[PDB]
Design an enzyme around this catalytic site. Structure first.
Site, PDB file in Angstrom:
ATOM      1  N   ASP A   1      -3.659  -2.557   6.633  1.00  0.00           N
ATOM      2  CA  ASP A   1      -4.177  -2.454   7.895  1.00  0.00           C
ATOM      3  C   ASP A   1      -5.350  -2.395   8.139  1.00  0.00           C
ATOM      4  O   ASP A   1      -6.175  -1.578   8.647  1.00  0.00           O
ATOM      5  CB  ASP A   1      -3.131  -2.105   8.180  1.00  0.00           C
ATOM      6  CG  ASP A   1      -2.927  -0.672   7.794  1.00  0.00           C
ATOM      7  OD1 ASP A   1      -3.302  -0.179   6.793  1.00  0.00           O
ATOM      8  OD2 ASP A   1      -2.262  -0.182   8.495  1.00  0.00           O
TER       9      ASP A   1
ATOM     10  N   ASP B   1       0.457  -1.574  -0.226  1.00  0.00           N
ATOM     11  CA  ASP B   1      -0.121  -0.135  -0.017  1.00  0.00           C
ATOM     12  C   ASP B   1       0.585   1.238   0.056  1.00  0.00           C
ATOM     13  O   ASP B   1       2.014   1.021  -0.091  1.00  0.00           O
ATOM     14  CB  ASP B   1      -1.034   0.130   1.151  1.00  0.00           C
ATOM     15  CG  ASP B   1      -1.911  -1.003   1.120  1.00  0.00           C
ATOM     16  OD1 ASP B   1      -2.084  -1.333   0.288  1.00  0.00           O
ATOM     17  OD2 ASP B   1      -2.237  -1.661   2.315  1.00  0.00           O
TER      18      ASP B   1
ATOM     19  N   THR C   1      -0.613   4.481   1.878  1.00  0.00           N
ATOM     20  CA  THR C   1      -0.503   5.590   1.976  1.00  0.00           C
ATOM     21  C   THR C   1       1.031   5.070   4.062  1.00  0.00           C
ATOM     22  O   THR C   1      -0.593   4.133   4.687  1.00  0.00           O
ATOM     23  CB  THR C   1      -1.655   5.930   2.831  1.00  0.00           C
ATOM     24  OG1 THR C   1      -2.523   6.597   1.943  1.00  0.00           O
ATOM     25  CG2 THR C   1      -2.040   6.953   3.736  1.00  0.00           C
TER      26      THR C   1
END
Ligand SMILES: *[C@@H]1O[C@H](CO)[C@@H](O)[C@H](O)[C@H]1NC(C)=O
Lengths: 911, 127
Positions: free
Chosen positions: A645, A356, A358
């Protein structure tokens, strides 16, 4: 000793949902005050210990782990060892009596078998100690949200009690059961208890009960603890591989080979003795003096058993488990915490990392680089600007800039909250204005992110405002502040001349535009310029990984050019050829005939092309990763390491071969379904995990070439020396000493190795590539040849060479030797100097270099050297050596350095 | 009866200047007379005392030859004792060898030479 424990273990927690009609006359805060509500904690850190002693303590233990006496009992049940003890007793048994010092050869076997089983047990005990060292620190870190003083803080899960308040939300667990008081939507999972893997409402009307071992899926809320420990419900019900297939197969083949070679030596020895005495060189002597002959059969059988001790490696897969243990404890310092003991070795064979963006690549400390207040793209950084301060300062009630960290030296503050907002307020503090002066002003209806088009707005004094994206809100906008200023009403003049011709030439063109819009059809206050910094290590890290065969594939929920910006700025999309990104919708369009998700086309297409999968869903990431690990084209493919997450990251992270989960801002459902927790989110930590996964699979074969060399040399010396003369030259105690130098102590010695950066220069292994490679076999056969030449030169001709008389052959009684001591010492010191030369596979030559990162190797080799220095001069007649002196030590050390040189010569002559 | 030697050394290693202690212990009756010999070119020879270094102490059933001030060129070889009475004789062989004249020094230089070879190879490859 005075509370409301009238049901002392089922205090209110029996069953749903006919319990909310009568809950101790049905009053939730009344049961709280009879048990303690909002909002207080404690004053007494012994009052918590009272309710520890009175219902109860939270930490639930396993029966752990095994006593040291249990492992000593365990390892004294190998059938080889018990046969060796029996024949040792018989060996001293035919000393007493026969028609002196013929006493120690059996006592030495018995006591030395006691010592070798003690050392193996101490090994296995320390192994379990390091796994407990992992388990303690992974039992920490799981903190919660307890209403203590109103200064609400995170305490560990074990030190929670009954009577306190938990403030839960989506993403985390339930550590202790209880009662709802306040709010909310609050759907939870119940997959750990009931088979209904579904979503269930919770409210003060239906089900004010929460169950430990489950996890909240969406919403928020606030509860009061009922039960902990084994007193809890899950505790009561709790009361009432990949690599090692090759090692077990290889060890069973070696077991059969050695099991036959020992029997060959036994049969040859009994046949050679009986023929060379009684049917030839005969004169048959068959008489009444029997037990000396049975005594020779006993000595032959002890040679057979003491070759089976060497020829079967007693624990070979325990190499994997030792090396992985010491690797876990040293990984834990490198930010990288391992939660399942199979994701260490599996990655490993990584080929793709569906990452990912971010927080994982970027620094997640963003700023406000550009701005559009003065009509245009003026660079880094008036009553309408006062209104702009009212926008940028009165955004929320939890903005939470706590700005004076960390050592008050360099102006690097951290923040609390969703970090675009704190970037906004941070570079609205750089315009030398007081935000905290105007944040009191007191807060009408300040809307959350939940809206129809999902902005986050505010209604305050009748000045209504709203943050939110330009392609989300700027469509609704009506006019522009004219250079302080006046109004200029919109058109597609704005939508093409500003939104296209001015907004799209943003930086590259990131990032994440919002507006901070006026309301009352809107008014364009300003927009943005937003940038998060890539970490300084990332563009090196992706290149270092990219050379190692692993193809990074970034997936995020983001739009749209932003991922292209960070891709080309990081180095994923090398902008020469290929490949193409997505918008978010098209991956669901490619393909469904008819709905769909045909694995033929999805496995085919578009396969190596999605390096960017922007505007994802968790379902989209799941579709991708489910598409990857399949029966596909190349038939090597593939082993993936996804990160992630979110709350909804259950199935996708579960299916992939090695999970990853963030551990700064990472929800607890993601950690419980994970395989490795990262502690500081750096993508370089995934690179270091790939490094350690290389390191375990190299350390196995780096153990194995040493162990295979000692096996070949010991077996051929025993067989051939026993075929020419009527005995093997290595007596039965020092053969067990060579067992202890090659099997447990060797694995503990050279299986613990720090990694290098040379493990990132090769293409990654495929999970069918063989276990003994070519250079492997070259080192094996080379060192085997050298040691056979040195041992047979010192075994057949060392007597006409320097001194002195031939030990071959000898009677039973016996004098120890002198000559066989030089054979034994050259053999053991030659294996010890081999134990440095087996530290390099995959090419040579820096040995010794650099053996000082290890403490363990450098203590085991020199310790074994000093122990043999003691064993040779001392304990002669027990351990079948004699009082050896220089010069003979110095010739033997010369031949040890001889193998240190000859193995370095094997670095040449390749194929 | 016939003489019979019981305890002796099959070998003896000494070095420069030490005292080589060779012995034979015999049994039988009467107590036999002791003659020390030396094996030279396939024939037993007597011990000639021109070196002044031979010292023979003979008792009834025990002997001891002690050759002080050993040198490499002459003193190593093969020795034997002869326990002789009126009934017969007996003989065992005690062999001497001396390790001197450097004495151990050659492989120490070997060690240092081999260290220098491998260190030179590591220097050559890493540049
Ligand atoms: C050799 O001569 C020395 C000089 O007197 C004497 O002490 C020694 O006993 C002699 N040994 C023999 C074997 O004659």
């Amino acid at each position: 000793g005075d509370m409301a424990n009238n049901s002392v273990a089922y205090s209110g927690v029996k069953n749903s949902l006919k319990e909310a009609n009568h809950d101790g006359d049905f009053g939730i805060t009344l049961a709280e005050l009879r048990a303690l509500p909002n909002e207080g904690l404690s004053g007494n850190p012994a009052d918590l210990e009272r309710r520890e002693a009175v219902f109860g303590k939270n930490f639930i233990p396993p029966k752990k782990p095994k006593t040291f006496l249990q492992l000593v009992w365990e390892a004294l049940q190998d059938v080889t060892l018990i046969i060796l003890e029996i024949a040792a007793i018989v060996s001293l048994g035919l000393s007493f009596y026969q028609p002196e010092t013929g006493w120690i050869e059996g006592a030495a076997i018995l006591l030395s078998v006691v010592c070798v089983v003690l050392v193996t047990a101490f090994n296995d005990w320390s192994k379990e100690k390091q796994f407990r060292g992992l388990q303690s620190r992974i039992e920490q870190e799981q903190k919660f949200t307890v209403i203590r003083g109103g200064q609400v803080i995170q305490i560990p899960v074990a030190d929670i009690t009954v009577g306190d308040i938990a403030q839960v939300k989506y993403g985390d667990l339930l550590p202790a059961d209880g009662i709802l008081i306040q709010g909310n939507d609050l759907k939870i999972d119940e997959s750990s208890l009931t088979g209904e893997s579904d979503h269930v409402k919770k409210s003060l009307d239906k089900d004010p009960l929460l169950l430990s071992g489950t996890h909240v899926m969406e919403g928020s809320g606030r509860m009061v603890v009922t039960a902990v420990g084994v007193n809890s419900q899950t505790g009561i019900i709790f009361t009432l591989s990949v690599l090692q297939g090759k090692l077990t197969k290889l060890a069973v083949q070696i077991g059969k080979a050695g099991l036959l070679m020992s029997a060959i030596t036994v049969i040859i020895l009994v046949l050679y003795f009986v023929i060379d005495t009684f049917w030839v060189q005969k004169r048959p002597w068959l008489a009444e003096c029997t037990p000396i002959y049975i005594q020779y059969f006993v000595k032959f059988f002890i040679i057979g058993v003491t070759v089976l001790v060497v020829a079967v490696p007693e624990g070979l897969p325990l190499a994997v488990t030792i090396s992985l243990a010491y690797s876990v404890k040293k990984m834990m310092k490198d930010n990288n915490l391992v939660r399942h003991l199979d994701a260490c070795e599996t990655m490993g064979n990584a080929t793709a990392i569906c990452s990912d963006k971010t927080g994982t690549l970027t620094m997640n400390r963003m700023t406000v680089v550009q701005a559009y207040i003065n009509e245009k793209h003026y660079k880094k950084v008036p009553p309408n600007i006062l209104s702009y301060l009212v926008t940028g300062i009165s955004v929320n009630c939890a903005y939470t800039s706590k700005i004076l960290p960390p050592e008050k030296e360099g102006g690097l503050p951290r923040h609390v909250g969703n970090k675009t907002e704190c970037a906004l307020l941070g570079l609205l503090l750089d315009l030398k204005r007081d935000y905290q002066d105007v944040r009191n002003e007191i807060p009408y209806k300040v809307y959350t992110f939940n809206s129809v088009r999902k902005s986050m707005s505010t209604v305050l004094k009748y000045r209504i405002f709203s943050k939110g994206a330009s392609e989300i809100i700027l469509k609704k906008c009506f006019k522009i502040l004219s250079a302080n200023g006046e109004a200029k009403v919109f058109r597609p003049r704005d939508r093409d001349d500003i939104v296209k011709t001015v907004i799209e030439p943003m930086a590259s063109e990131g990032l994440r535009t919002i507006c901070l819009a006026f309301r009352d059809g809107l008014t364009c206050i300003a927009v943005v310029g937003i940038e998060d910094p890539v970490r300084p290590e990332v563009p090196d890290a992706i290149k270092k990984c990219q050379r190692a065969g692993i193809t990074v594939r970034m997936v995020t929920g983001d739009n749209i050019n932003t991922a292209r910006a960070i891709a080309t700025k990081c180095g994923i999309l090398h902008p020469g050829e290929d490949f193409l990104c997505l918008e978010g919708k098209d991956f669901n369009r490619r393909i469904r005939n008819e709905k769909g998700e045909i694995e033929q086309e999805r496995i085919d297409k578009i396969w190596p092309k999605l390096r960017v999968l922007a505007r994802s869903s968790p379902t989209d990431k799941h579709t991708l990763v489910k598409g990857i690990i399949d029966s596909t084209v190349s038939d090597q493919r593939q082993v993936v390491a996804v990160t992630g997450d979110g709350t909804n990251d259950g199935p996708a992270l579960k299916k992939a071969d090695v999970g990853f989960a963030m551990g700064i801002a990472g929800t607890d459902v993601a950690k419980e379904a994970s395989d490795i927790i990262l502690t500081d989110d750096n993508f370089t930590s995934i690179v270091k995990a790939v490094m350690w996964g290389r390191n375990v699979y190299d350390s196995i074969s780096k153990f194995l070439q040493f162990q295979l060399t000692v096996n070949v040399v010991a077996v051929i010396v025993a067989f051939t020396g026993a075929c020419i003369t009527q005995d093997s030259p290595l007596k039965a105690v020092q053969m067990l000493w060579v067992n202890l130098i090659m099997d447990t102590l060797a694995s503990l010695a050279l299986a613990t190795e720090p990694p290098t950066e040379s493990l990132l220069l090769r293409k990654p292994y495929g999970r069918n590539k063989p276990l003994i490679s070519r250079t492997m076999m070259k080192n094996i056969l080379g060192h085997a040849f050298y040691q056979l030449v040195v041992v047979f030169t010192l075994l057949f001709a060392g007597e006409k060479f320097f001194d002195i008389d031939s030990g071959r052959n000898a009677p039973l009684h016996a004098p120890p030797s002198e000559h066989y001591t030089i054979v034994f010492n050259t053999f053991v010191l030659m294996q010890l100097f081999n134990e440095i030369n087996a530290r390099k596979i995959h090419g040579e030559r820096n040995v010794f270099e650099g053996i000082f990162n290890n403490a363990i190797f450098c203590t085991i080799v020199l310790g074994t050297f000093v122990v043999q220095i003691i064993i040779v001069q001392f304990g002669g007649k027990p351990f079948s050596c004699s009082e050896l002196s220089i010069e003979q030590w110095l010739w033997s050390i010369f031949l040890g350095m001889g193998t240190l040189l000859w193995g370095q010569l094997i670095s040449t002559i390749p194929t | 009866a016939a003489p019979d030697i019981t305890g002796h050394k099959r070998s003896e290693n000494k070095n420069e200047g030490q005292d080589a202690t060779m012995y034979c212990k015999s049994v039988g009756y009467p107590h036999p007379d002791w003659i020390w010999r030396k094996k030279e070119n396939g024939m037993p020879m007597d011990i000639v005392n021109t070196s002044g270094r031979f010292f023979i102490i003979n008792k009834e059933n025990y002997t001891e030859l002690n050759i002080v001030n050993l040198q490499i060129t002459e003193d190593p070889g093969e020795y034997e004792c002869n326990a002789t009475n009126a009934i017969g004789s007996a003989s065992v062989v005690t062999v001497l060898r001396v390790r001197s004249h450097l004495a151990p020094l050659w492989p120490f230089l070997g060690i240092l030479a081999e260290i220098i070879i491998l260190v030179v190879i590591i220097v050559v490859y890493e540049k």
